[PDB]
Design a protein around this ligand. Sequence first.
Ligand SMILES: [Zn+2]
Ligand SMILES: [Zn+2]
Ligand SMILES: [Zn+2]
Ligand SMILES: [Zn+2]
Ligand SMILES: [Zn+2]
Ligand SMILES: [Zn+2]
Lengths: 353, 353, 353
Amino acid sequence: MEVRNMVDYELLKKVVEAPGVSGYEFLGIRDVVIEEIKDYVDEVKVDKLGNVIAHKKGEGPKVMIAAHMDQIGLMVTHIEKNGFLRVAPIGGVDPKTLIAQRFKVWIDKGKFIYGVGASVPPHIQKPEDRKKAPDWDQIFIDIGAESKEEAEDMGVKIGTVITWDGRLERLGKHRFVSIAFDDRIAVYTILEVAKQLKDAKADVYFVATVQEEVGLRGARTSAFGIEPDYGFAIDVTIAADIPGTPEHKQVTHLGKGTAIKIMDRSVICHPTIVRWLEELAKKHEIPYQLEILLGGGTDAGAIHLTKAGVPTGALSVPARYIHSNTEVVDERDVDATVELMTKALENIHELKI
Amino acid sequence: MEVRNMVDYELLKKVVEAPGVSGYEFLGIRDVVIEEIKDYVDEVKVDKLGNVIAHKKGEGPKVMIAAHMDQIGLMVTHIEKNGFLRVAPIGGVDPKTLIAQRFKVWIDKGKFIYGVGASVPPHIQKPEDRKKAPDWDQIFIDIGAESKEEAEDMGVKIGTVITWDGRLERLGKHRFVSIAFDDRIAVYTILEVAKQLKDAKADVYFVATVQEEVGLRGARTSAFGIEPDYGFAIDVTIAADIPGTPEHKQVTHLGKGTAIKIMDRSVICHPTIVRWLEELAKKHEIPYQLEILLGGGTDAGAIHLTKAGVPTGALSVPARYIHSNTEVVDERDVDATVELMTKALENIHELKI
Amino acid sequence: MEVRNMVDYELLKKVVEAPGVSGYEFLGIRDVVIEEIKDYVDEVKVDKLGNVIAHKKGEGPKVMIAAHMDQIGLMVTHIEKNGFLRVAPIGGVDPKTLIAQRFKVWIDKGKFIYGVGASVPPHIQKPEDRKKAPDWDQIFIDIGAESKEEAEDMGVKIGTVITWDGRLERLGKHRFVSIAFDDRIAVYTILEVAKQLKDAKADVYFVATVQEEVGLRGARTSAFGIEPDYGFAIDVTIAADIPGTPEHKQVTHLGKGTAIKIMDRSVICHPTIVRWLEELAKKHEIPYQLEILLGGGTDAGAIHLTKAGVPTGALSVPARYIHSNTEVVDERDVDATVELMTKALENIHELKI
Ligand SMILES: [Zn+2]
Ligand SMILES: [Zn+2]
Ligand SMILES: [Zn+2]
Ligand SMILES: [Zn+2]
Ligand SMILES: [Zn+2]
Ligand SMILES: [Zn+2]
């Protein structure tokens, strides 16, 4: 569990279990996040996009910290005549992982039924048989209903209703958390920062955006008013020590320290900030890694689209996986990000250049 | 839950949760099965192959009922230098389903750690990328260990250690059980029969074989002494109402009644028995379906390999799925099999021809 | 030569040179094996299948040790009009290795002529040219005859007549034997065990089966009466330290210690026995390796098909190769198997569970 106690098992659990997709019946997560942040922040407001803005009052430059909380999911597009639930693809999800088992379909907030639809109708052809990759039709999920009417009675209606579902378990008693890696974590890092934030050298606005994995632009909207005068965002992706993988990708992750995003698809970290963070980490002896991604966009990049033209830095939590099959995290990694980020906040007054 | 109460939720749960692979640390299931059967049978003995033989004393022909309890699993073949656990294929498992999440690796009886290894190293090629089907190398499972030494310390040793793992949930509040379909169910049907068996017109030997999904022959060995003078075995497979599927396969399953195996890969049900069971079902108004399989072998077929040359009939529980992604069952189906089988037992004296 | 003297050079030579295929003109090997075993066993009998049963009299459980001695070969199917000898495929032989040179065609016991037929008629096509893999027609062997009549005069008649042929040489003066790996070796291990067997805690029946590489079932027949009450069989296969080979296969063999078969295609070693042997090896400080195979069947598995339902363990001699091109063995490996097996025999009384 809390091997280092750096990450509370309870906080990680509450956030990871909460449904993803704010504003959606999965919105329970939105309420949860604000439930705890309000205790350590002067106030929290809900934006039009459902974005949550936490306001830390202090003197200094406005630093915006943005964490994404869109997670991933699947949307039912219609009900088959056989009472089977169909699904529509979402982005940030790989069809190859489609679904293997246990899917949570939310009929309503607090009302969900287990559904499975890991298998898609077999293709015809001995070679196509080899093709185990499902077609764009994706896969279908069965609510167990026998008729479309029954499915409707179940309360299944068009609109994203299904979430990946999973369980938080500890892998490697020495360290490592399961589905804690995406979804929540960065949000967890933001919560921890607020908790340990005492002397505010600079006031920090915490913004949790939605639709970050898809429609990241919406996240930018919250960033628009809060992100002015600097901002940081935390998303994570990793090529990590996998067999058959070249060293060039292994360097992407090592399961140690933390990762500072040198550049991403949408944000080329302002060199001073990237370089500066590196300096800061060494001074405090905080472990860090330099990670560059060839693809993927972060909310930080979205912040870069603000008309303010504010530079953005990014922090990364190494030990990335994809949500569909895994989401292993490094306990140290979550801690490393929080520690580095917290110190950086005070330093930001000088750090702002 | 017990919508019809035909299948107790508790009994189904205990059997499905028990690990699969008797004699193996998964052997906990073996003990469980005998734990309950001993109360309703005069005695239970453990064979050399770990097969369990329940002896119902009565007067009449010896009828052997055989249920398989091998389930499916994966075996670690070695420990990678990176501390990753590797796996070796088992039979009755489809690589395409490989593993999506949460895998249970048993270090010892009662000691297991969660492991994940749903993803296999990406292939090189834009088209091979489409190929989402993993190679024979199969997939690898990470125990979260960082070093082979650590993995060994974890207690991971060569030998099948991993089980699919899953959770028993109710799908369709109207009916349907998740991972209850394979593994346990038929065994459950056998237990229920014993429980409701009161007046024994004929003595019935209940044999639970192991290595049925693989090395079905071993199951035959138990059948060798017990199966003499008739025997029945229950395994299940279904082509069931799936979209894009031709009607010719839909007829295989309908999620109603039960299924009598007309013929399988290894057993051509003795026509009299198949026909006879049909007659019996109609007389008692028990729903039934005639199912023929083009492939797959049942333990009943294995019984057919006895030197006695005893004919074997087979009962099937419709609503088949594969263990890797699903295992939906029909509550009615479990009930239908039990009801039909129980009545058949007494009728067997006349029925034996 | 006898670097450790663990394996006599003379015994290895006599067995490896003897022709393979008992009952066949290659049957000379059958006589040889019984020639030496009779001196250390109370008696030897020839079964109907040509199987040889050695009877070690002692008190205790009956332990059956089975070694295969079918080797591999090729059968002439007809005589071409050009006087060329044709061949039919055998199983356990890879066409790709077909034949490179020097083939021994037995016209009669003690009468053989050298024949070559490493090349098969070239295919037509610049790309098919690349295909160096011969077709199912396999390859043809020339007895040097110019006419079918001459070939017949030579005494070439339909029926497997040809053996791979080879020479026993020492590779690596430090250790390693050539064509000693398959064919003979396990048989050699059985002979050595009998020789060093003095105090018989348990009586051991030694059975040498035939048609093990093909028609392994026949081997089971001898096992049927002798294998009752436990049995062990030794066959070998290796993925061994080959370049371009992944570590996951390298672990299969290391050219050190011996290999205990955890599971094979047909036998899932009884866990207690596998585990037990491991315990025994450590106690006596005998080197061992755990090897699992994804394919291949061993005679031990065949023993598992006995109606007795007797559990079987298996010992493996690492450093496997295929008979067609190589058959390198580790001298230590042959010794390790013998040492471990001999101690196990006495322990078997307690070991039997
Ligand atoms: Zn994501
Ligand atoms: Zn993310
Ligand atoms: Zn199965
Ligand atoms: Zn089954
Ligand atoms: Zn061979
Ligand atoms: Zn062999």
